[PDB]
Design an enzyme around this catalytic site. Structure first.
Site, PDB file in Angstrom:
ATOM      1  N   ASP A  78      11.343  15.674   6.424  1.00 14.46           N
ATOM      2  CA  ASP A  78      10.783  14.128   6.624  1.00 14.46           C
ATOM      3  C   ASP A  78      11.351  13.432   5.840  1.00 14.46           C
ATOM      4  O   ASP A  78      11.193  13.668   4.627  1.00 14.46           O
ATOM      5  CB  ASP A  78       9.220  14.181   6.446  1.00 14.46           C
TER       6      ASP A  78
ATOM      7  N   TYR B 259      12.574   5.226   1.507  1.00 14.86           N
ATOM      8  CA  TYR B 259      12.442   6.168   0.112  1.00 14.86           C
ATOM      9  C   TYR B 259      13.735   6.458  -0.590  1.00 14.86           C
ATOM     10  O   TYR B 259      13.871   6.796  -1.751  1.00 14.86           O
ATOM     11  CB  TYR B 259      12.250   7.552   0.727  1.00 14.86           C
TER      12      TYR B 259
ATOM     13  N   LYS C  33      12.604   7.375   9.680  1.00 19.28           N
ATOM     14  CA  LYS C  33      11.722   6.137  10.149  1.00 19.28           C
ATOM     15  C   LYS C  33      12.401   4.672  10.050  1.00 19.28           C
ATOM     16  O   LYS C  33      13.088   4.611   8.923  1.00 19.28           O
ATOM     17  CB  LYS C  33      10.534   6.386   9.281  1.00 19.28           C
TER      18      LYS C  33
ATOM     19  N   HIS D 231       7.980   3.168  11.128  1.00 19.42           N
ATOM     20  CA  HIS D 231       7.337   3.693  10.202  1.00 19.42           C
ATOM     21  C   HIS D 231       5.943   3.127   9.999  1.00 19.42           C
ATOM     22  O   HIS D 231       4.963   3.809   9.528  1.00 19.42           O
ATOM     23  CB  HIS D 231       8.230   3.273   8.822  1.00 19.42           C
TER      24      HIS D 231
HETATM   25  N1  LIG Z   1       4.724   7.997   7.242  1.00 17.47           N
HETATM   26  C1  LIG Z   1       4.193   7.384   6.066  1.00 17.47           C
HETATM   27  O1  LIG Z   1       3.921   6.251   6.022  1.00 17.47           O
HETATM   28  C2  LIG Z   1       3.991   8.426   5.235  1.00 17.47           C
HETATM   29  C3  LIG Z   1       3.246   8.073   4.096  1.00 17.47           C
HETATM   30  C4  LIG Z   1       3.152   9.216   2.947  1.00 17.47           C
HETATM   31  C5  LIG Z   1       3.842  10.404   3.020  1.00 17.47           C
HETATM   32  N2  LIG Z   1       4.489  10.444   4.091  1.00 17.47           N
HETATM   33  C6  LIG Z   1       5.297  12.056   4.016  1.00 17.47           C
HETATM   34  O2  LIG Z   1       4.472  12.800   3.660  1.00 17.47           O
HETATM   35  C7  LIG Z   1       5.045  13.596   2.741  1.00 17.47           C
HETATM   36  C8  LIG Z   1       4.004  14.233   1.943  1.00 17.47           C
HETATM   37  O3  LIG Z   1       3.054  13.346   1.262  1.00 17.47           O
HETATM   38  P1  LIG Z   1       3.142  12.969  -0.333  1.00 17.47           P
HETATM   39  O4  LIG Z   1       4.485  12.836  -0.782  1.00 17.47           O
HETATM   40  O5  LIG Z   1       2.537  11.606  -0.444  1.00 17.47           O
HETATM   41  O6  LIG Z   1       2.311  14.094  -0.957  1.00 17.47           O
HETATM   42  P2  LIG Z   1       1.768  15.439  -0.980  1.00 17.47           P
HETATM   43  O7  LIG Z   1       2.838  16.220  -0.169  1.00 17.47           O
HETATM   44  O8  LIG Z   1       0.492  15.417  -0.478  1.00 17.47           O
HETATM   45  O9  LIG Z   1       1.658  15.628  -2.591  1.00 17.47           O
HETATM   46  C9  LIG Z   1       2.952  15.845  -3.278  1.00 17.47           C
HETATM   47  C10 LIG Z   1       2.624  15.973  -4.577  1.00 17.47           C
HETATM   48  O10 LIG Z   1       1.927  17.343  -4.649  1.00 17.47           O
HETATM   49  C11 LIG Z   1       2.792  18.270  -5.704  1.00 17.47           C
HETATM   50  N3  LIG Z   1       2.774  19.643  -5.080  1.00 17.47           N
HETATM   51  C12 LIG Z   1       3.642  20.112  -4.165  1.00 17.47           C
HETATM   52  N4  LIG Z   1       3.276  21.479  -4.041  1.00 17.47           N
HETATM   53  C13 LIG Z   1       2.408  21.865  -4.838  1.00 17.47           C
HETATM   54  C14 LIG Z   1       1.925  23.013  -5.276  1.00 17.47           C
HETATM   55  N5  LIG Z   1       2.012  24.190  -4.667  1.00 17.47           N
HETATM   56  N6  LIG Z   1       0.902  22.979  -6.114  1.00 17.47           N
HETATM   57  C15 LIG Z   1       0.687  21.893  -6.889  1.00 17.47           C
HETATM   58  N7  LIG Z   1       1.020  20.800  -6.620  1.00 17.47           N
HETATM   59  C16 LIG Z   1       1.865  20.807  -5.686  1.00 17.47           C
HETATM   60  C17 LIG Z   1       4.199  17.663  -5.513  1.00 17.47           C
HETATM   61  O11 LIG Z   1       4.789  17.980  -7.145  1.00 17.47           O
HETATM   62  P3  LIG Z   1       6.424  18.131  -7.319  1.00 17.47           P
HETATM   63  O12 LIG Z   1       7.009  17.289  -6.316  1.00 17.47           O
HETATM   64  O13 LIG Z   1       6.255  17.737  -8.614  1.00 17.47           O
HETATM   65  O14 LIG Z   1       6.409  19.568  -7.191  1.00 17.47           O
HETATM   66  C18 LIG Z   1       3.868  16.089  -5.608  1.00 17.47           C
HETATM   67  O15 LIG Z   1       3.411  15.470  -6.837  1.00 17.47           O
HETATM   68  C19 LIG Z   1       5.782  12.511   1.952  1.00 17.47           C
HETATM   69  O16 LIG Z   1       7.039  13.046   1.077  1.00 17.47           O
HETATM   70  C20 LIG Z   1       6.668  11.598   3.029  1.00 17.47           C
HETATM   71  O17 LIG Z   1       7.650  12.663   3.491  1.00 17.47           O
HETATM   72  C21 LIG Z   1       4.710   9.726   5.208  1.00 17.47           C
HETATM   73  C1  LIG Z   2       3.195  -1.805  -4.761  1.00 20.22           C
HETATM   74  C2  LIG Z   2       3.652  -1.025  -3.667  1.00 20.22           C
HETATM   75  C3  LIG Z   2       4.368  -1.652  -2.438  1.00 20.22           C
HETATM   76  C4  LIG Z   2       5.043  -0.656  -1.530  1.00 20.22           C
HETATM   77  C5  LIG Z   2       5.089   0.547  -1.972  1.00 20.22           C
HETATM   78  C6  LIG Z   2       5.646   1.296  -0.863  1.00 20.22           C
HETATM   79  O1  LIG Z   2       6.990   1.259  -0.728  1.00 20.22           O
HETATM   80  C7  LIG Z   2       4.953   2.546  -0.055  1.00 20.22           C
HETATM   81  C8  LIG Z   2       3.818   2.639  -0.131  1.00 20.22           C
HETATM   82  C9  LIG Z   2       3.293   3.948   0.641  1.00 20.22           C
HETATM   83  C10 LIG Z   2       4.832   4.429   1.077  1.00 20.22           C
HETATM   84  C11 LIG Z   2       5.129   5.820   1.631  1.00 20.22           C
HETATM   85  C12 LIG Z   2       5.453   5.518   2.868  1.00 20.22           C
HETATM   86  O2  LIG Z   2       5.147   4.223   3.549  1.00 20.22           O
HETATM   87  O3  LIG Z   2       6.014   6.335   3.703  1.00 20.22           O
HETATM   88  N1  LIG Z   2       5.548   3.590   0.469  1.00 20.22           N
HETATM   89  C13 LIG Z   2       7.184   3.889   0.393  1.00 20.22           C
HETATM   90  C14 LIG Z   2       4.728   1.278  -3.041  1.00 20.22           C
HETATM   91  C15 LIG Z   2       3.849   0.493  -4.038  1.00 20.22           C
END
Ligand SMILES: NC(=O)c1ccc[n+]([C@@H]2O[C@H](COP(=O)([O-])OP(=O)(O)OC[C@H]3O[C@@H](n4cnc5c(N)ncnc54)[C@H](OP(=O)(O)O)[C@@H]3O)[C@@H](O)[C@H]2O)c1
Ligand SMILES: Cc1ccc(C(=O)c2ccc(CC(=O)O)n2C)cc1
Length: 316
Positions: free
Chosen positions: A44, A49, A78, A111
C-alpha cells in the site's frame, strides 16, 4: 484462510499487505524487499507519503531478481487531494507509476473525498490556516479515475475515507462506468466501523482496514490516547492464542472479510505480522474485540473539517 479475495473487477486482492505511510525513505526499500521475501504480495503506497521512488526500487529489484512476477504482486496507490481536477489525474497517476517503476497499478484509490486547490503544497492553506478547496466534485474525479482504467494505467479503481453517503453518491452517479472495487478506511477494535463495512460489503465493495495497530507512530500521538497494542484485554486474547498482540490485531479484520495493511520498517515485525494464517480467533474473541469500539480515529483530517466533502461529520 485464503490469501486473496475476489474484487468486482474480477481480480484477486491479497488480504494482507504492507503499509508504507511514515516509512522513512532510507528504510522503506529494505522494508519492501524483506516483505516480498517473507511472502507479502500487496503493497500500500501513496504519492503523499513521498516515499514511492524508494518503494519502487524495492519492487523493481525483486522483479529483476525473479523473486516474484509482476502478475503476482498487487500494488496500490492513491490520488492526492490536490490532484482532483480532471486534467491533473492522469499526470498524478503517471508520476506514481514512474516512481514505483511500474506500467500499471492493480488498484488506484481516491485518497480522500476532499479536493484541494492544485499546486506544490499538499495542504494549501489560506492566510488564516484553513485548507483551500477545489471546486471539482467527487463524481467528476470519479469519471477521471474510470478513464485511467480505460487507458490501461490501472486494473481497478477505488475510494478511501468515503462515508456511506459518499459511497452512495458514487454508486448513484449518472452514467457510472466502473463501481469502486475498494473503500480503504481506518478500522481496528477502537473504531469498528460496523455500519460502513456492512454497507460497502452489501454493495460488493471490498473494505481495506488501515491503521490496524492504532498507528503508534502517528505524529500527533498523545499519552491520554487509547493504545491498542498496550490494551491488556487484547494482550490477554493474544496470550491465550500464543500469538502477539499485533498478530491478533491483524487477524481480527481478516476474519471480518477485510483486507488489512499493517505498516512496519522493522524486519522482525514485518515477518511476524505475516504469520497470521496459522490460527483462528473464535466468534467470542471477535465479538469481544468488537465490543471495544470507542469511535476513536487516528486520522481525522482535522484541517479539513469545514470542507464540504469532509467525511467524518456523518455518523458513518
Ligand atoms: N488511506 C488513508 O488515508 C490511510 C491512512 C492511514 C494509513 N493508511 C495505510 O495503512 C497503513 C498502516 O497504518 P499506519 O501506518 O497508520 O499504522 P499501523 O500499521 O496501525 O501501525 C504502524 C506502527 O506499528 C508498529 N508495528 C508494526 N508491527 C508491529 C508489531 N508486530 N509489534 C509492535 N509494533 C508494530 C510500527 O513500527 P515500526 O514501523 O517501527 O516497526 C509502526 O510504528 C499505512 O502505512 C498506510 O499504508 C492509509
Ligand atoms: C498536521 C498534518 C497535516 C497533514 C498530515 C498528513 O499529510 C496526513 C494525515 C493523515 C495521513 C495519512 C493518509 O492520509 O494516508 N497523512 C499523510 C499530517 C499532519
Amino acid at each position: 484462510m485464503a490469501s486473496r479475495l475476489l474484487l468486482n473487477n474480477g481480480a484477486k486482492m491479497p488480504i494482507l499487505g504492507l503499509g508504507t505511510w511514515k516509512s522513512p525513505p532510507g528504510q522503506v526499500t529494505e522494508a519492501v524487499k524483506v516483505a516480498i521475501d517473507v511472502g507479502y504480495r500487496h503493497i500500500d503506497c501513496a504519492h503523499v507519503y513521498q516515499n514511492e521512488n524508494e518503494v519502487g526500487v524495492a519492487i523493481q529489484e525483486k522483479l529483476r531478481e525473479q523473486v516474484v512476477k509482476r502478475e503476482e504482486l498487487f500494488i496500490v496507490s492513491k490520488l492526492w487531494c490536490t490532484y482532483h481536477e480532471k486534467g491533473l489525474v492522469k499526470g498524478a497517476c503517471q508520476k506514481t507509476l514512474s516512481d514505483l517503476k511500474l506500467d500499471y497499478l492493480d488498484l488506484y484509490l481516491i485518497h480522500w473525498p476532499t479536493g484541494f486547490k492544485p499546486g506544490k503544497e499538499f495542504f494549501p492553506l489560506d492566510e488564516s490556516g484553513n485548507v483551500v478547496p477545489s471546486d471539482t466534485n467527487i463524481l467528476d474525479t470519479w469519471a477521471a479515475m474510470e478513464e485511467l482504467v480505460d487507458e490501461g494505467l490501472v486494473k481497478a479503481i477505488g475510494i478511501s475515507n468515503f462515508n456511506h453517503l459518499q459511497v452512495e453518491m458514487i454508486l448513484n452517479k449518472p452514467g457510472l462506468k466502473y463501481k469502486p472495487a475498494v473503500n480503504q478506511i481506518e478500522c481496528h477494535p477502537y473504531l469498528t466501523q460496523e455500519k460502513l463495512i456492512q454497507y460497502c460489503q452489501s454493495k460488493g465493495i471490498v473494505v481495506t482496514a488501515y491503521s490496524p495497530l492504532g498507528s503508534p507512530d502517528r505524529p500527533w500521538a498523545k499519552p491520554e490516547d487509547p493504545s491498542l497494542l498496550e490494551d491488556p484485554r487484547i494482550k490477554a486474547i493474544a496470550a491465550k492464542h500464543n500469538k502477539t498482540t499485533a498478530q491478533v490485531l491483524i487477524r481480527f479484520p481478516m476474519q471480518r472479510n477485510l483486507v488489512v495493511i499493517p505498516k512496519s520498517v522493522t524486519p522482525e515485525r514485518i515477518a511476524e505480522n505475516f504469520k497470521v494464517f496459522d490460527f483462528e480467533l473464535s466468534s467470542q474473541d471477535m465479538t469481544t474485540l468488537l465490543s471495544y469500539n470507542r469511535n476513536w480515529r487516528v486520522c481525522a483530517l482535522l484541517s479539513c473539517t469545514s470542507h464540504k466533502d469532509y467525511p467524518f461529520h456523518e455518523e458513518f
